[PDB]
Every structure is written in C-alpha cells, then in structure tokens.
C-alpha cells in the first residue's frame, strides 16, 4: 500500500477507532490511529491557519493551528522521517465527508524544503487557485477555480457541502527530502482553511500529508478515513 505521513485536522470524534471525545489535531504515521493528539477548539465558518515544521537534526514533527482572536492548539511527536518515507516524495492536502458533512475549502497554501550538504531548495506559494492549475494534481472530487479557492470535497451550486465525498490535491513536482551528502534537511508548510457546515456535527476533516510519488486515493476511504488510509488498522 501507500506510505502515509500526515497531520490531521479531525472534526468528528470516532471513539471506536481511537479518537478523543472532541475535535482534535493529530500526527498520523502510516495509520489513521494517531500517535499523538491535542484538543482543538474548532470554529464553524471561521478562517483558520495551520503551520507544520520539521528538520532532520531534531527529528521532531510539530504542528500549530489557530484562529484570529483565540488561543492556539499545538502537538509534537518524535519521529525519524528517513526511516518511514522514501527518498523522493510528493506533498499535498486531503479531506473527506461521510454521513455527516462539511465544506473543506483551502484559501492559500505554501511549502518550503531545504537540503544543505557539506544548498538545494524548493518553494511554492498559492494565494489563489485558477481554473486550470497545471502545477497541481487533483484527485477525487477536488476542484479549483470557484471564487479562486480550492474545494477538496464536493459542494453544490448553492454552496451546500455534500456527503460521502473525498478529494486530494498534490503538487506536481516531486520533493527531495533526503540525500547522502546532506547535513541538514528541513521543511515547513502553511495553509489557510475554511470549514463551514449547517449541521451541529461537522465531518470529517482536513489533512496535510506526505507520501510516495505515485500515491492515489484508497478505495472506500471516504468519511473517517480522510482519504488517506485503506482501513482503520
């Protein structure tokens, strides 16, 4: 199967598969059952911001999520990504809905990776998404262009989110995260999102993920599986 490393923004508590009894952020290593979670005070209809950072010296994957005029939520986990991911990877965003639903809108997205030997770099930034974004790989129900935004999951014309939807968006160019002569390897990611729902129980969430370059959406990965994992193991 695919190799997945992801930071999940989980809006629906599936307590039967390890989720806490509240909206949360988590670090997923090849499993939907997070290795580490933190309580997330999610706000319906508000624009949020997420930061993800990592470097090969400290070997620590940390993430910070916040809303304007509010306190932030953070979570960290010690993991050597060189022992999990291949040398060449692709980065992207994923989201899903099930019987419960929500809008999974992305307003902006930036990413930067550095390889310092004894310096190679890649940086891209989207502040608006065009109708034909040729430097993005869209999978599933993901579409671009609507109000210059990226809609990961299906949304009707009236602006109402649909259930049983799943979509992913990956950057076109592969990313080099390890090299034999490298002394320091690091990356940082930032994206702004807008989750809206007419229901009192939104679902299922958004995730930033890193995977093998030929990764595709697993079958039946709608709902709680966030379009990343084939099962709940």
């Amino acid at each position: 199967a695919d190799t997945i490393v992801a930071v999940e923004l989980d809006t629906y508590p599936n307590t039967d598969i390890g989720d806490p009894s509240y909206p949360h952020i988590g670090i997923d290593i090849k499993s939907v059952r997070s290795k580490k979670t933190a309580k997330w005070n999610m706000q319906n209809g508000k624009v949020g911001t997420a930061h993800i950072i990592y470097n090969s010296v400290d070997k620590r994957l940390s993430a910070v999520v916040s809303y304007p005029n509010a306190d932030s939520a953070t979570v960290s986990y010690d993991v050597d990504l060189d022992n999990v991911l291949p040398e060449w990877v692709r980065v992207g965003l994923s989201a899903s809905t099930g019987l419960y639903k929500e809008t999974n809108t992305i307003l902006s997205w930036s990413f930067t990776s550095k390889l310092k030997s004894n310096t190679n770099a890649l940086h891209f930034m989207f502040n608006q998404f065009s109708k034909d974004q040729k430097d993005l790989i869209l999978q599933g129900d993901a579409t671009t262009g609507t109000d210059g935004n990226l809609e990961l999951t299906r949304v009707s014309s009236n602006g109402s989110p649909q259930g049983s939807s799943v979509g992913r968006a990956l950057f076109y160019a592969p990313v080099h995260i390890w090299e034999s002569s490298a002394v320091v390897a690091s990356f940082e990611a930032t994206f702004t999102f807008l989750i809206k729902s007419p229901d009192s129980h939104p679902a299922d969430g958004i995730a930033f993920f890193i995977s093998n370059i030929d990764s595709s959406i697993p079958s039946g990965s709608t709902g709680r599986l966030l379009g990343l994992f084939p099962d709940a193991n």
Copy 2:
C-alpha cells in the same frame, strides 16, 4: 513547431546565419537569428555566471554574463512575452556541439517567478545534481551525477567532449507566467557554467530557454542550432 524564447551563449561565430565575427550573447525570439547581440569575452576552462531578468511592467528582457576578476557583458531587448509565449510554460537549459566541440557543464541553477494580483510564487535552486534527479526532465545526451554536475552534452570517461551532441534539461513542474488578475509578473534566472575545450575553436554554446510545456529537441538541431530550432530561418 515549438515556441522558443532563449538567451544564447554563442561560442562559435556562424557569420552566414547572422552571427557576429566573435563569441557573443544574444536574445532569440522564435529564431536562431538573434534580435540583439553583444560581444562576449569567453574564457576557456573558467567558471562563468549568467543572470536573466524580466518583468511585465517594463517588458524588457535583460541578461548579464561575467567571469571572476573581469568586466561583464550585457544585452537587453524590448519584448512583450505575453504576445509570444503561452500562459503556461516550462523553463530549461540547452547546449550542443557540431564538428567543433566543447564541454557544456552546469554547476548550479536557480529560478524564481512571481505573480502578483490585485501573490503566487515558484522558486527552485540546484547547487548539486544527483544521479536520479526526478524533478528534472532530461532530453538528448544530457546526464546528471558526474561529480555532482549536469553535463548537457556528451563527455567521454577521460573528460573529453564529443562532437555532434545535443542535450536539454527542463524543470518538471510547469510555470505560470500570466494571469488575468495579475498586475505584476516577473522572473529571474541564474546559472553557473564551465566551458572547456582542447581546441582553439570551441562550439557551439549554451542557452537558457522558455517554451511550451511539451517541447522536445527538434530533428537535426545539433551544432549551430543549439538544440532549440528546426532550421536557421
């Protein structure tokens, strides 16, 4: 045919097709016959540096080439790239040899493009090239990995350059150079090169080019055609 906009580092004077009677730098717009040239004091076996800049406000393509401890050579040309190139393009480097030969080695390469609306950006930088550079499209005789360098044209094991060779290297991800809401569009490119030859008459040169995303090497474009143009029209 392909749409080509290139800055040529011409080492061999082909006076029958418009070249001046000396090594030169030039601006090529859909033709090997440069719209504008400048005298270039090329140095055999020395590492040089080239800078290329452009923005949509001034609509001026300028280039600067220099060696350490020496005076620089520069050339500019007024041209609206929006009236020549498509909305989505690819960028890359090209080189060739004919009956006369030279080494076309690339030591480093950086590129940055900006789209500011009423900001989207792409930046990559190579200071060393690996054996399997997955984020590069290699065409022709171009190879990577040899001493961490990029060899555009064929070079034997003893380090001797071969004749009748041609090779190009393009960045994997397409580049967005125009948008309907953009108020300012700009890009800058920089690469370091090493041209070596045991002969008194090296040939044929190196070029940085911009083209349609599906561009490939034209037939019989070795030698004076720099692997960019099908003929000398």
Copy 3:
C-alpha cells in the same frame, strides 16, 4: 539639503505647482514637481496596494498601484539612481495633511534589495506594527501600535484625522544600493495603505522614498510638500 527619490501617491491636485487636475501617482527626483505622472482612481476608505521596482541594468523606476476588483494605475521613468543617490541610503514612508486632511494608515510593508557581484541581500517584512518598534525610526507625528497599524499622520481618539500633520517612518538599518564589484543591483518594495476622510477633498498623500541615511523632516513641509521637500522648486 537632503537627496530625495520618491514615488508619490498624491490625493490633492495642486495645479499651481505642476500637479494634474486629478488624484495621481508620480515619480519625484529631488523635487516635488514630478518628472512623470499617471491618473489615479483613488477610493476613499478602501485598502490599496502599491508595488515599486528597479534594477541597475534597465535603469527604470516603475510603480503599480491597485484596489481590489478594479483596474490598476502604473507609471515608469528612466533614471540612473547611481547618479542621484549616495552609495549608502535609508528607505521609508512619508505622509502629510494641510488645511485639507485624511488618514494615512499603513497596514503592511515589505522590502528587498540585492547586490550581485562577479550575492548580498537585505529583506524585511511587517504585517503588523508593535507599540515599541525598535527597528523603525519614527519622525514627526508618526506612531505605531494602534490596532497593530502604522499611523503616519495625527489621528484623534475617535478616529478622525487632523490637519497640518506630518510623519515619516524609516527602517533602522542602512541599505547598500551600489558596489564597485556589483554586476546587478535591484530592489522591490510593497506596502498596503488605507486612506479615509470625512471630506470630499482629502489631502495630501503618501510617499515611499529613498534618501541619505541622516535625512530628517524639512521645516514647513506639511501639506503639499509631503514631508519630503523644503520648497516647491
């Protein structure tokens, strides 16, 4: 006196000193009488954005100003800044009011300068201004901290702008814009502004300027002189 190179956002037409009969943007070279102007459709109470660019190869100072959902205004002028400005300079923002008044609020400010020899760089970015901005030199009535913004001219507690006011803000560190070994020198500036006024005739405007490191506000430079020039010569 001081050496001033500035891009003016002129909101009040002083036709007796060369101004066109409408709000305009202009390039000022050691004089308030602009060398080049362009019509500016200024919008009261709306957030605008200004871009300024220059490089030593083309020797062209260009500026672009725009509002959301509207067409932009642009102006360019050919000038060798090496023949006008000293080797070391300071950059900053200036504004003024006279008998007519307006708010001169700055929401963000970014600047980048590059010196490439045969590479030295400086970059700073403000997206919010703190109460004690130690890396800024405040002159006149300029204050920081109010709603995280930079107020160049005097504004009362109720949010009403005051007349006969003048204020400037300069970056603390000097900027190197020329070097003997430099082959390419360039800079770009961007700032967002908010001009509000209860009157039908706002005044007097905002300007981005470059000057000698020890520049201060000239006496009686309120109103039409934009806090940059001692007289209207």
Copy 4:
C-alpha cells in the same frame, strides 16, 4: 552584566574550566562553561561551515558544523530562549586569541528570523564584506575589507595572526524574537569560516551569539573567554 546565548567553536581545551580534552562545539547559556558539548574534528587551514537553528515550538537549540569531504559534528540542547533573552536582541559573531593564536576569518554570513502571529521577517546575507560596512557594528580588533573578508581578530600584513586579540561584529538592526500574539517564532543562521595557524596548538575559537542590544566586549575577555564573558563562572 550582559545576557549571552552563544554557540562556541572551541579550538583550545581549557580543562580547568570544564572543557573536554579536545577541540569541541558547545552551547553556552550565560556562562563559558557549556551546558552541552560535542567532539569537533577541526581542520587547520580549511574552510568550514556552521548551521544554527531554533524554534519556539520545540524549544531546542541545535548546531551543525562540517568540512568538505568529511563527517559532520552536531550538538543540541533543550532551552526556552524566552526565559533567558529579552524581547529585543542583537545577533553577531565573536572570536579571541590568547598566548596561543589563530586566524578568525569569516567568509560569509546569513541570518533569518520569523514571527508568525494568529508574518514578520528579517533576513540578511553577506557573501563579501566591504571596507565601510555601515550595517555592521564592529567592536574590538574586528576589521572588514581585507580580501573582502571579515577578520574578527588581529592579523598582521604578512597574514600572521596576533595573540591577545579580541573582536566582535554585530548586525546594525535589532531583532524581534518574541511577541505577545506570536504563535511560532524561529531563526536560522549560517556562516563560513577559515581558521589558520602556524602553531600545533591554535586558540581560542569563534562563537555565534545572541545578546541584549547594548552589549559590548567585557574587560579582559581575551583568550579562553571568547570575548563574551567577564569571568569563568
């Protein structure tokens, strides 16, 4: 006294004050007695490179030093810099010699700091130092301009290093490392150095440091005190 946080490149083992019995790199927190050290295979007359990184989420100060064609040395230490340093600081480089001596030459220096709230940034880069570097504060015997390099300690005309010397170089503009609304604060530093000595026992070393904005060289801080600390407590 001054508040000092520094990463030392210690070339001379002063075992009576806590040094290991070999050249080493260390993390100094308000004391010359390092909180954490690592063995450093220093090479006389070779150009080295040092990387220093930190962020407010992980609260971990890590450093990596390496030479070409050789294995690297690294050291990390958990410390909350918000509980040690003031809100506004200055960054710089320091070096010293005693009865034993060495050249403390700096070839390049880059620094980047980020403040992300619920983004402010500062970045500068020196690849060559001019005779009159107005954006640097030179203290002690530090001079700029010699072969475009920065000589922290005294060197005679013949290129021979002098004993009992001390010099520091700080960036002119203050740096903001903490803010009440900040959710993520980080910085990274990189500099290349050349340590040469005709002796078999070079001394005393080079250090990158962070301090209060009004920091100056302590009396009698030559030799083992690296020009940072008043005593060996």
